[PDB]
Scaffold this active site. Structure first.
Site, mmCIF file in Angstrom:
data_model
loop_
_atom_site.group_PDB
_atom_site.id
_atom_site.type_symbol
_atom_site.label_atom_id
_atom_site.label_comp_id
_atom_site.label_asym_id
_atom_site.label_seq_id
_atom_site.Cartn_x
_atom_site.Cartn_y
_atom_site.Cartn_z
ATOM 1 N N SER A 111 0.851 -1.228 0.000
ATOM 2 C CA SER A 111 0.000 0.000 0.000
ATOM 3 C C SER A 111 0.891 1.286 0.000
ATOM 4 C CB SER A 111 -0.861 -0.030 1.284
ATOM 5 O OG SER A 111 -0.088 -0.221 2.502
ATOM 6 N N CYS A 112 2.259 1.097 -0.096
ATOM 7 C CA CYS A 112 3.297 2.127 -0.004
ATOM 8 C C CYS A 112 3.038 3.380 -0.837
ATOM 9 C CB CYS A 112 4.646 1.523 -0.314
ATOM 10 S SG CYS A 112 4.732 0.036 0.676
HETATM 11 CO CO LIG Z 1 2.845 -0.832 0.161
#
Ligand SMILES: [Co+2]
Ligand SMILES: [Co+2]
Lengths: 202, 227, 227, 202
Positions: A111-112
């Site tokens: 989800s970075c």
């Molecule tokens: Co991520």
């Protein structure tokens, strides 16, 4: 529950809620955490950070050609000089949309997303449909966001597999003659800076 | 590990649920806010996890049905629990009874404590971050412009080497420097930094689709070989 | 399609729940028995599906959370519904109302009908089967002993070409003959049979593990290329 | 249910039950199905078929060396001559365990298994843990079944990606001198014919 099939049965969301409360409670009792440490974090992420920081950088780049150029040459330096630095924003790169190159960013593995510059990711950005599809069929994924690019624009998808983070610098639209830096920053959407949308004329 | 978290290239997950950003609320439940505070609260103090490698492996180790159903901060709750128990900050039994207590009585009062000095600690983490850049003595094995082939490897522990990019030709787009190496850091085996590279891959090499799509991916040196 | 059904090589699914065979019961609920009767009942008559290609694509098209939670005959119920609606044997609306009726009143009486001639039909399917072997005019492209490389392809429809065996060297172990081709038959696009081969792969080529393990896989000709 | 996250929520098993009943009901009303057609299928699979058919073939192979040899040369012919033929058993191959080669079979893509010879698959055989792992780490999977092979035995895993089916011919154990064909067939387990177990001395 048949004990040959426990993997068929997920924890209900009530379980995650209870687990969360158990961990808070244990951590406070043992002196690992306090009430105000938890609430300081929540205050930071829910209210202190937001896409308005990237929007300021985008409007600056649009109104100041010397700064745009500094930014693209060494975004980590420039952004850090602006104060846009912190947890999950220590190494931020800016990738420029041009007429024939459109950038989109993703974290296929989780989800970075660069919190210090853009705030918290979209709901969809963290979910499997977008993570799975955008690297294989970015043109179909973009059409669902209303962005139907010609066959002659190249799409570069940037997967955040490391702690390096990416922000997209969207093109200034038509119809914005004579408006100021601050006005232009209100045009900049969260989505244009992930690359799932262009910016509409006002 | 080849888990359900590694979704790049998979089919069947359906359409993207677009919502206008001003309608895309952050948190709908107080425990999702709690999850955020637990993760940064602990990490800022080196509790359970000194950075995100250990945080990411706890998520990847979730049961596949939990992963796809927990909702997002349910991942975060899982990894907090897994890492705190695993380093022996928390006892497993003790944590399960206390969970049982809030399942059976979700109104149980949370004890309250003020520690302004801790607040300061936590702010240092938010503002200073946890940059994984390090210096090492060795020289980069690859250079910008160079054609490499990614390895066909299947580590059973944590990697940042996505399945879709395994065994593919690509070209070095940038040498970032040496960064802490996730495959060992996640398992508490040392920072053992390695050069990190950005690598450009063509749609034709990844998928067999000839079209003007490209994927850029950051890959540690040990994921790749010269041709 | 690259869906969660294609699990070969994945990590995280946990330990195998061994049970002694004499304790390993077939069915614990009457609807799982019902699923079996619906699948063979329909297939024996060419309803929704003339063979297993169409049956398998309905399963692969399930939502990933349904796939991992439905239990096994829940897959079968899903594909029956999907294929019957898709060929227009059943109407979607009509099926959803009737489902709603048994959700709200699970005691609703099932109407009863005896059709001994149908019984005979169904027995023919069980005893005669649905062999996909066909003859074609073309000659096999590969021969026993030959080293091939499997293609790097990612069909978005149904295949029998598992991800783990994509882009791998192997060797032809046998030329079976031409069999109906799943990638088109599943989508009702013709039987269009192709030569089928058995192909041997070494653990080192599949996984990078050097050890005395091998996988044998049947692959249609169009999944592979000469070296 | 938040409509950004419908994929988080599975159909309960009560839904599959209701769907099943709806399909039966619709099909009976329209004359596509009858009560006795459904019950004929159920009777076949729950009671008519079983691992006892493969067990007879295994004991025959063990007591009749001419038949073992016919079987390994052309199992489709031999098995069909015995009556072991039908839906999902039209092309059955027998792969022989020897002292240094152990065979195990799997359907990584679903659950494919030769019903006319072996009956219905094990519960675990259809589940992800076994499907995912056995092709990559067959030695670890076998240890969970109690079978710890030496490094010097080769494991061949046979993935049923087509309509071709595989049955394993297990080795006759020690300690079975002078027992008859019928007696030996009662030794043959379902698991030895998938290759997840050897046969114990009696
Ligand atoms: Co991520
Ligand atoms: Co199968």
């Amino acid at each position: 529950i048949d004990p040959r099939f426990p993997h068929h049965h997920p924890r209900p969301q009530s379980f995650w809620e209870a687990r969360a409360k158990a961990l808070e409670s244990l951590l406070i009792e043992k002196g690992h955490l306090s009430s105000d440490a938890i609430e300081r974090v929540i205050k930071h992420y829910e209210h202190e950070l937001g896409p308005m920081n990237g929007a300021k950088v985008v409007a600056k780049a649009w109104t100041d050609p010397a700064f745009k150029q500094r930014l693209l040459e060494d975004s980590e330096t420039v952004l850090r000089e602006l104060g846009y630095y912190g947890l999950q924003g220590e190494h931020i790169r800016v990738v420029e949309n041009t007429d024939t190159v459109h950038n989109v960013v993703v974290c296929t593995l989780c989800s970075c997303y660069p919190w210090p510059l853009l705030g918290l990711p979209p709901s969809w950005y963290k979910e499997p449909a977008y993570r799975a599809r955008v690297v294989k069929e970015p043109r179909q994924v973009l059409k669902e966001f209303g962005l139907d690019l010609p066959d002659s624009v190249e799409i570069r998808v940037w997967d955040s597999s490391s702690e390096i983070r990416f922000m997209v610098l969207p093109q200034r639209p038509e119809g914005t003659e004579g408006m100021t830096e601050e006005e232009l920053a209100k045009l900049v959407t969260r989505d244009s800076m992930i690359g799932v949308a262009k910016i509409e004329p006002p | 590990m080849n888990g359900i978290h590694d979704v790049g290239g998979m089919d069947g997950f359906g359409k993207v649920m677009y919502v206008k950003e001003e309608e895309d609320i952050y948190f709908t439940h107080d425990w999702e806010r709690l999850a955020f505070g637990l993760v940064a609260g602990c990490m800022a103090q080196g509790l359970g996890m000194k950075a995100f490698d250990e945080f990411r492996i706890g998520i990847e180790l979730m049961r596949p049905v939990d992963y796809l159903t927990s909702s997002y901060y349910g991942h975060w709750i899982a990894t907090v629990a897994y890492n705190l128990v695993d380093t022996g900050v928390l006892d497993e039994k003790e944590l399960d009874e206390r969970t049982e207590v809030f399942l059976k009585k979700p109104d149980t009062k949370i004890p309250r404590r003020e520690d302004p000095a801790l607040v300061k600690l936590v702010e240092k983490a938010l503002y200073d971050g946890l940059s994984p850049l390090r210096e090492i003595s060795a020289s980069p094995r690859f250079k910008v412009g160079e054609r490499i082939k990614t390895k066909n490897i299947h580590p059973t522990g944590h990697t940042r080497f996505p399945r879709y990019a395994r065994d593919k030709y690509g070209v070095i787009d940038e040498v970032y420097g040496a960064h802490v190496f996730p495959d060992d850091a996640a398992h508490r085996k040392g920072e053992n930094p390695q050069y990190l590279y950005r690598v450009r891959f063509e749609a034709e090499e990844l998928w067999g689709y000839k079209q003007k799509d490209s994927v850029y991916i950051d890959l540690w040196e040990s994921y790749m070989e010269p041709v």
